[PDB]
Amino acid sequence: PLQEMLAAPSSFKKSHVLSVTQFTRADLHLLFQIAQEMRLGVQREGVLDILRGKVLCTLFYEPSTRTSASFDAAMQRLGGRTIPIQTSTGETLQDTLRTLANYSDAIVLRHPDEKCVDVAKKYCPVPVINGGNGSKEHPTQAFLDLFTIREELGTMQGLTITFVGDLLYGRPVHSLVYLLRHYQVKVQLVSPKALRLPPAVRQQLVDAGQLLCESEALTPEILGRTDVLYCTRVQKERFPSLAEFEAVKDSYRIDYSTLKYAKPTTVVMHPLPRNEEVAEEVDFDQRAAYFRQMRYGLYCRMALLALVMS
Amino acid sequence: PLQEMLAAPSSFKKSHVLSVTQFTRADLHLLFQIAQEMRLGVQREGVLDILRGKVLCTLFYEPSTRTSASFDAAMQRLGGRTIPIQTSTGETLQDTLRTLANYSDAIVLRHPDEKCVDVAKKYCPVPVINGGNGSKEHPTQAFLDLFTIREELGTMQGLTITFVGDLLYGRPVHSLVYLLRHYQVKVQLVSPKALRLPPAVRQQLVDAGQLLCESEALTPEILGRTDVLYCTRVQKERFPSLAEFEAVKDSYRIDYSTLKYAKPTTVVMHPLPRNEEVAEEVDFDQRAAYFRQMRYGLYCRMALLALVMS
Amino acid sequence: PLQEMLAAPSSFKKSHVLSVTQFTRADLHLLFQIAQEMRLGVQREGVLDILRGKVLCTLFYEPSTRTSASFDAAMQRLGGRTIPIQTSTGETLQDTLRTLANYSDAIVLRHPDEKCVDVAKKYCPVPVINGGNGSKEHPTQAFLDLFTIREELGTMQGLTITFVGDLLYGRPVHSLVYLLRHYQVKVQLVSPKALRLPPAVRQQLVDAGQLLCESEALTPEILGRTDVLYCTRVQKERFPSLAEFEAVKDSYRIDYSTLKYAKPTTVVMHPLPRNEEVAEEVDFDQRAAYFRQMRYGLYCRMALLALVMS
């Protein structure tokens, strides 16, 4: 049933996983199927059998424990072997990739240079998974985000999604807008005017018939119609004047006074790490899904690794 | 026989392991039984079968190779999988614990903040083993210490234990006094007056009918009645005047001129690392047990991991 | 057939691997046999069975991803378990070795002090593999180098080997000269006069009837008779005057204008890392063997680990 679904055909098999723009609605539907199966297999036996004999190497030039350990644990729970590497940007990336390709069957790469995906494509002779390229894309983060929504709420039809915070530099938002192109959702965008979406991402939303509201304020009416409250970090450097920055924090902080205006079923998401824009007092609330996000990311990356490495 | 003893009931199963004050004489007797079995299993097959399908994550905010690699090797020799994380104290500990709990079935945590155990108790949804909380407790170090004594000398009745060095800041001593509450031992305490035991730990000893001698000098008579010479590091910062500090080093240094006054059967212990308070010239001496300590700690942590994770 | 060849007798079994001067022509012939078998086993099943139940610990005091990950991947592909340690030169090496010997069945050690091999011999109770001792020796690098030549060109009789660059501080060259003592090869040595071989290594070559040419220039005639072009890094510190250093770079740089004077079958080798002394424009050329080197090193280290740990 799982050996079945992994028998199926996919763009993932033997492929680099560098951008969400490589994958179709069907690609992701199959992936999410396999991720449900992965969750069942693990719930019963802990470490499965899919990838005995396969070696994954993780190559992180900047540390991101959530992502690197997620891939480590996914590979090992597939029954594969992992080689975790920590380094910093003097040997070039293309030399390191070609070095490590001789040891492993695939590499997860996170690197401060967004052109790293291009280097990986030109030089690396094994599949590379893009674990973050200068903060431009992080495709499995987009995957696990979409999956989180599906899993927590059921069908995508009818949903209203509210992105809050820094939507200019918040690329996980942009990647997720792309993945939502296939769905009859409405979207609200709460941000200062200085940090609205890039005009082309906004244009992606109006083109799909999805842009509902744009607002600088996180209001009880916006909150009352939110099925999904996807928050982003808002860093002080994005503002010239500190006063502005704190005004915007206090406005956007998800705490109990903010959740009271929400729905009983509102899913609160966050790619993490967070500063104070989601209060700790909310972590135990059923609607707080940002730790369940990471267990969903476990099952999605098991599926992705199974598909890429057969 | 081992599947038998792991069938048995214990406070360890599914529990946080944060303090020695959580465990009874029976708890530790069972643990030591299982540790003897672990040593046999490993002596014959290297990597056992107990914890296939289980994932342990080690989370060390300060490096301690002896402890982190001991737990890595214990888990893997149980047939489980390990995810070793190195980080430093900006994401909070409770967020990191909840992140990693989605990947592993338990976490070993070492952290500079002694309140970390409380954080782990409030937030973490998988068992946490306390690998050292701001140097206040290190329970498996206490376990392997008691086990070391048992293993090297047989029965605890009749023993004289001599703690030497810095007994104020030497908490492994305090934890071990607690674990020795059950035993008819006598204890000698050699330290400067500035670094005697905390009055309550001393009071724990007189209450048990165990305090034999307190001395600022490491004397041939104290040495002649020592079954166990447990040394601690003496750091220069614990003294205002350098002269005092070196006087105390030279007095307490375990070398050949000091061992000659000891028994042929005196077990010399040290939690490690050491500076010069145990001379290298003594390392090959049969009585030098501070490297055998760590192989005993291997078997004890295999037992503890087997019990906690079933 | 592999269980056969590992049944055979070898100086490797249970031995420290510290110097090329420990091993005979037969030792290396057997090793290369087993490495061919390792390549076949892995090509069909990924992770083999040879060393289930064995634990290897890697202990690198300076990072060298190519070497540490090569040994990690070799052990794991033998079916053993690995414990990778990263540290820096306050606990002594002999204390760390004795600590870790209680957890693993062998240790790969790389350390800035060339005397580390002596420390390892005096104190460590498990086999130690020398992964680099203050840049004096790196024996498995020599092994994989010789194997690379054999594999790419067939029989050693008739070959001309040309070492280029910094032959004084290039010890992999010296180790490889030693390993070539058994073979009817000719050797050319291209280097500035300031960086010729040590007189005793040169004397090793004339004693074997092998020194063909010594030159400060990399000439079309030297290139035309090169079967193996083994390049070394040339670092700016080896020259007082920058002008000299760049003159020597430009002279020695392997690029297309330099390869045109070579043979169609010239194997270009490099221990790596490289600066600019092999141009990127050459990496895709069939003759560029410095990434295949590392896959050969994978199979050689699998063989060496299998032999040392039975």
Q: What distance lies between CA C198 and its chain's CA centroid?
A: 19
Closest CA to A304 of A61, A18, A60, A1: A18
- In angstroms, the CA B297 to CA B301 distance is 6
Q: CB-hemisphere CA count at 13 Å for B272?
A: 24
Q: Which amino acid is at A28?
A: L
Positive or negative, the Cα torsion across C58, C64, C65, C71?
negative
Q: Which amino acid is at A77?
A: R
- In angstroms, the CA A134 to CA A227 distance is 31
C-alpha separations of C45 from A308, B288, C32, C259 in Å? 17, 46, 20, 38
CB-based contact, B47 to chain A, within 8 Å: no
| Alpha helix stretches (DSSP H) within chain C | 2-7, 25-45, 65-77, 93-101, 116-123, 139-153, 171-180, 199-207, 220-224, 242-252, 256-259, 292-308
C-alpha separations of A104 from A55, A111, B304 in Å? 5, 19, 33
Tokens representing C152 are 């790419």
Sequence-ordered list of residues with C-beta below 8 angstroms from that of A269, at least 6 positions apart, any chain: A145, A148, A149, A228, A229, A230, A231, A289, A290, A293
Q: Name B187's bridge partners.
A: B161, B211
C-alpha separations of A215 from A45, A166, A234, C78, C214 in Å? 48, 12, 16, 59, 76
The answer to whether A158 and A145 have CB atoms below 8 angstroms apart is: no
The answer to whether A126 and A104 have CB atoms below 8 angstroms apart is: yes
Which residue shows structure tokens 């794991």? C76
C-alpha separations of A141 from A67, A129, A247, B301 in Å? 9, 12, 29, 36
Closest CA to B304 of B177, B139, B95: B139
Cis peptide before A273 (omega within 30 of 0): yes
Q: Name B86's bridge partners.
A: B60
- In angstroms, the CA C281 to CA A123 distance is 12
Answer yes or no: do A103 and C70 touch at CB < 8 A. Answer: yes
The answer to whether A173 and A232 have CB atoms below 8 angstroms apart is: yes
Closest CA to B228 of B257, B262, B197: B262
Instruction: Count CB atoms within 10 A of the CB of residue A297.
Output: 26
Closest chain A C-alpha to B91 CA, distance in angstroms:
7
H or E segment to which residue B222 belongs: helix B220-224
Q: Which residues of C touch A96 (CB under 8 A)?
A: 65
C-alpha separations of A57 from A31, A104, A105, A184, B293 in Å? 22, 6, 8, 38, 34
DSSP tag of C293? H
DSSP tag of B49? S
Which residue shows structure tokens 């005092």? B244
Sequence-ordered list of residues with C-beta below 8 angstroms from that of B57, at least 6 positions apart, any chain: A69, A73, B82, B83, B84, B85, B100, B103, B104, B106, B107, B108
Q: Name C129's bridge partners.
A: C17, C108
Q: CA torsion, points A31, A35, A36, A38, in degrees to nearest 10? A: 140
Closest CA to A222 of A256, A191, A188: A188
CB-based contact, A91 to chain C, within 8 Å: yes
Sequence-ordered list of residues with C-beta below 8 angstroms from that of C244, at least 6 positions apart, any chain: C192
- In angstroms, the CA B134 to CA B113 distance is 5
Angle at B134 between CA B129 and CA B137, to 5 degrees: 55
The answer to whether A73 and A298 have CB atoms below 8 angstroms apart is: yes
In angstroms, what is the resolution? Answer: 2.3
The answer to whether B51 and B79 have CB atoms below 8 angstroms apart is: yes
CB–CB contacts below 8 A, B to C: 60
CB-based contact, A103 to chain C, within 8 Å: yes
Instruction: Count CB atoms within 10 A of the CB of residue B222.
Output: 21
The answer to whether B27 and B303 have CB atoms below 8 angstroms apart is: no
* Domain B138-296 is found in CATH 3.40.605.10: no
Closest CA to B231 of B298, B293, B150: B293
Of B94, B96, B103, the CB nearest to A73: B103
Q: Which residues of A touch B102 (CB under 8 A)?
A: 291, 294-295, 298
A52: nearest CA in chain C?
Answer: C47
Exposure pattern of C200-221 as b/e (b: 16+ CB <10 Å)? ebbebbeebebbeebeeebeee
- In angstroms, the CA B51 to CA B302 distance is 10
- In angstroms, the CA C267 to CA C287 distance is 5
Cis peptide before B273 (omega within 30 of 0): yes
Q: Which residues of B touch A47 (CB under 8 A)?
A: 52-55, 81
The answer to whether A265 and A289 have CB atoms below 8 angstroms apart is: no
Closest chain B C-alpha to A281 CA, distance in angstroms:
12
Closest chain A C-alpha to C213 CA, distance in angstroms:
32
Answer yes or no: do A102 and C291 touch at CB < 8 A. Answer: yes
The answer to whether B189 and B176 have CB atoms below 8 angstroms apart is: no
H or E segment to which residue B30 belongs: helix B25-45
Interface of C with A in 258-297 (CB under 8 A): 272-274, 280, 283, 291, 294-295
- In angstroms, the CA A105 to CA A305 distance is 11
Q: List phi, psi (to 5°) of B133.
A: -115, 100
Cis peptide before B139 (omega within 30 of 0): no
Q: Which residues of C touch B69 (CB under 8 A)?
A: 57, 83, 85, 99-100, 103
- In angstroms, the CA B188 to CA B205 distance is 10
Q: What is the DSSP string of A209-261?
A: T-EEEEESS--HHHHHT-SEEEE----GGG-SSHHHHHHHHHHH-BSHHHHTT
Instruction: Count CB atoms within 10 A of the CB of residue C50.
Output: 23
The answer to whether C242 and C236 have CB atoms below 8 angstroms apart is: yes
The answer to whether C208 and C307 have CB atoms below 8 angstroms apart is: no
Q: Which residues of B touch A295 (CB under 8 A)?
A: 102
Q: Which residues of A touch C280 (CB under 8 A)?
A: 94
Q: Which residues of A touch C272 (CB under 8 A)?
A: 91, 95, 99
Q: List phi, psi (to 5°) of B171.
A: -65, -30
Tokens representing C54 are 């064995």
- In angstroms, the CA A224 to CA B15 distance is 41
Topology of domain C1-137+297-310 in CATH is: Rossmann fold (3.40.50)
Closest CA to C81 of B301, B80, B43: B80
Sequence-ordered list of residues with C-beta below 8 angstroms from that of A250, at least 6 positions apart, any chain: none
H or E segment to which residue A85 belongs: strand A81-86
Which residue shows structure tokens 């034999």? B212
- In angstroms, the CA B70 to CA B66 distance is 6
H or E segment to which residue B96 belongs: helix B93-101
Of A63, A70, A86, the CB nearest to B103: A70
CB-based contact, B96 to chain A, within 8 Å: yes
- In angstroms, the CA B161 to CA A159 distance is 70
Of A55, A91, A98, the CB nearest to C291: A98
DSSP tag of C2? H
Beta strands per DSSP E along chain B: 55-60, 81-86, 106-111, 128-133, 160-164, 186-190, 211-215, 228-231, 267-269
Closest chain B C-alpha to C42 CA, distance in angstroms:
22
Exposure pattern of C73-105 as b/e (b: 16+ CB <10 Å)? bbbbbbbbbbbbbeeeeeeebbbbbbbbbbbbb
Q: Do the domains C138-296 and C1-137+297-310 match in fold?
A: yes
- In angstroms, the CA B262 to CA B257 distance is 10
Radius of gyration of chain C (CA): 20
Sequence-ordered list of residues with C-beta below 8 angstroms from that of A188, at least 6 positions apart, any chain: A160, A161, A162, A163, A212, A213, A214, A215, A222, A225, A226
CB-based contact, A244 to chain B, within 8 Å: no
CB-based contact, A52 to chain C, within 8 Å: yes
Q: Which residues of C touch A68 (CB under 8 A)?
A: none
- In angstroms, the CA C295 to CA B151 distance is 46
The answer to whether C194 and C238 have CB atoms below 8 angstroms apart is: yes
Experimentally, how was this structure solved? X-ray
H or E segment to which residue B75 belongs: helix B65-77
Angle at A190 between CA A185 and CA A193, to 5 degrees: 130
β-strands C81-86, C106-111 pairing = unpaired
Interface of C with B in 60-89 (CB under 8 A): 81, 83-87
Sequence-ordered list of residues with C-beta below 8 angstroms from that of B10, at least 6 positions apart, any chain: B27, B30, B31, B307
Sequence-ordered list of residues with C-beta below 8 angstroms from that of C66, at least 6 positions apart, any chain: A99, C272, C273, C294
Task: Return the SS3 of B153.
Answer: helix
Of C81, C85, C104, the CB nearest to B65: C85
C79: nearest CA in chain A?
Answer: A53
- Direct distance between the N- and C-terminal alpha carbons of chain C, in angstroms, rounded to an integer: 15
- In angstroms, the CA C297 to CA B111 distance is 39
Sequence-ordered list of residues with C-beta below 8 angstroms from that of C148, at least 6 positions apart, any chain: C267, C269, C289, C292, C293, C296
- In angstroms, the CA C238 to CA C245 distance is 8
- In angstroms, the CA B74 to CA B70 distance is 6
H or E segment to which residue C106 belongs: strand C106-111
Instruction: Count CB atoms within 10 A of the CB of residue A90.
Output: 5
- The domain segmentation of chain C, as residue ranges, is 1-137+297-310, 138-296
Q: Which residues of C touch B35 (CB under 8 A)?
A: none
CB-based contact, B5 to chain C, within 8 Å: no
Burial label, B256 (beta-carbon count in 10 A; 0-12, 13-18, 19+): exposed
Positive or negative, the Cα torsion across A38, A43, A46, A48?
negative
Burial label, A128 (beta-carbon count in 10 A; 0-12, 13-18, 19+): buried
- Indicate the angle between helix axes A292-308 and A25-45, nearest 10 degrees: 110
Closest chain A C-alpha to C303 CA, distance in angstroms:
15
The answer to whether B174 and B228 have CB atoms below 8 angstroms apart is: no
The answer to whether B22 and B15 have CB atoms below 8 angstroms apart is: yes
Sequence-ordered list of residues with C-beta below 8 angstroms from that of A59, at least 6 positions apart, any chain: A85, A87, A96, A97, A100, A107, A108, A109, A110, A111
Closest CA to B308 of B136, B106, B111: B106
Sequence-ordered list of residues with C-beta below 8 angstroms from that of B168, at least 6 positions apart, any chain: B191, B194, B195, B196, B197, B198, B238
- In angstroms, the CA B152 to CA B264 distance is 13
CB-based contact, A162 to chain B, within 8 Å: no
| Alpha helix stretches (DSSP H) within chain A | 2-7, 25-45, 65-77, 93-101, 116-123, 139-153, 171-180, 199-207, 220-224, 242-252, 256-259, 292-308
Burial label, A284 (beta-carbon count in 10 A; 0-12, 13-18, 19+): exposed
Closest chain C C-alpha to A242 CA, distance in angstroms:
41
Of C55, C87, C98, the CB nearest to B76: C55
- In angstroms, the CA A88 to CA B278 distance is 39
C-alpha separations of C295 from A60, A128, C309 in Å? 22, 18, 21
Answer yes or no: do C65 and A85 touch at CB < 8 A. Answer: yes
Q: What distance lies between CA B62 and its chain's CA centroid?
A: 17
Answer yes or no: do A105 and C70 touch at CB < 8 A. Answer: no
- In angstroms, the CA B236 to CA A201 distance is 61
The answer to whether C209 and C246 have CB atoms below 8 angstroms apart is: no
Angle at B76 between CA B137 and CA B114, to 5 degrees: 15
Tokens representing C282 are 């050459």
The strand order across the sheet containing B160-164 reads B211-215, B186-190, B160-164, B228-231, B267-269
Q: Phi-psi category of B46—alpha, beta or left, where left has phi over 0 and alpha has psi -120 to 50? A: left
Closest CA to C162 of C138, C185, C195, C141: C185
Question: Residues preceding discontinuities in chain C at C–N > 2.5 Å?
Answer: 89
- In angstroms, the CA B16 to CA B97 distance is 13
